[model samples]
Target: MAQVQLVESGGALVQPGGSLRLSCAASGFPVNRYSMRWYRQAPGKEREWVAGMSSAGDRSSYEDSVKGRFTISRDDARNTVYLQMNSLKPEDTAVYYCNVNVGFEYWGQGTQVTVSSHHHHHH
Candidate 1:
């Protein structure tokens, strides 16, 4: 079982209309066979898949339930994958998570993120 961790601790700055990149770093055996996926959770709500990427660099497969403003990519050589969302909005506030897929199984640490200013709360 691979352990998935997202790089979301440090703060990222956006000029109110710029772009943002959220990333994840995962590790485990058979890492090359699994796929990494990103998801978001509304405040006190459920999680949803935003996008997914395979070790082969194919990202055309995405969940239709996801909003189109989000996309995912990976640097498999470094065991790192990224999620970039454009046209930032205040409604983008949410905690994001990363997961690794193997067959029908996956593992994740369930990291949280907020798009609001550091002084603001998600509630």
Candidate 2:
């Protein structure tokens, strides 16, 4: 059952204006030459592209909403891909997937991240 796997973590809770970091590792192949990407799927909504990182020069590109706040990178030494987003929001809550080969040919198991608000209020 060789495939991509997302590292499990405690939770996605992050304060407003904080950063969100997620990662994925590949198996059964060298991931240094393949393109990697990050995607977000809210609840039952369709998955949306967040950004992509080139294995060539480690170059990256992000969607409008992810721009400025998101960073996509790779760690060839660990056969892993990294996705980081600064200044998160509640709307950013979703399941994130790390894919390889410029498409969904290979993907992680999906990690859910939740952004927490700073304002204290009785809910």
Q: Name the best candidate (by TM-score).
A: 2
* Model 1 segments more than 4 A misplaced: 1-15, 29-32, 54-57, 63-68, 103-106, 117-123
List ranges where model 2 is wrong by over 4 Å.
Answer: 1-11, 102-104, 120-123
lDDT of candidates 1 onward, in order: 0.58, 0.66
Give per-model TM-scores. 0.63, 0.73
For candidate 1, report its TM-score.
0.63
RMSD of model 1 against the true structure: 5.7
Q: Lowest lDDT 10-mer window, candidate 1?
A: 4-13
Candidate 1 per-residue lDDT over residues 48-90, each given as its tens digit: 6667666565444666645477777666577666676766777
Instruction: List clash counts for every candidate, in order.
Output: 1, 0
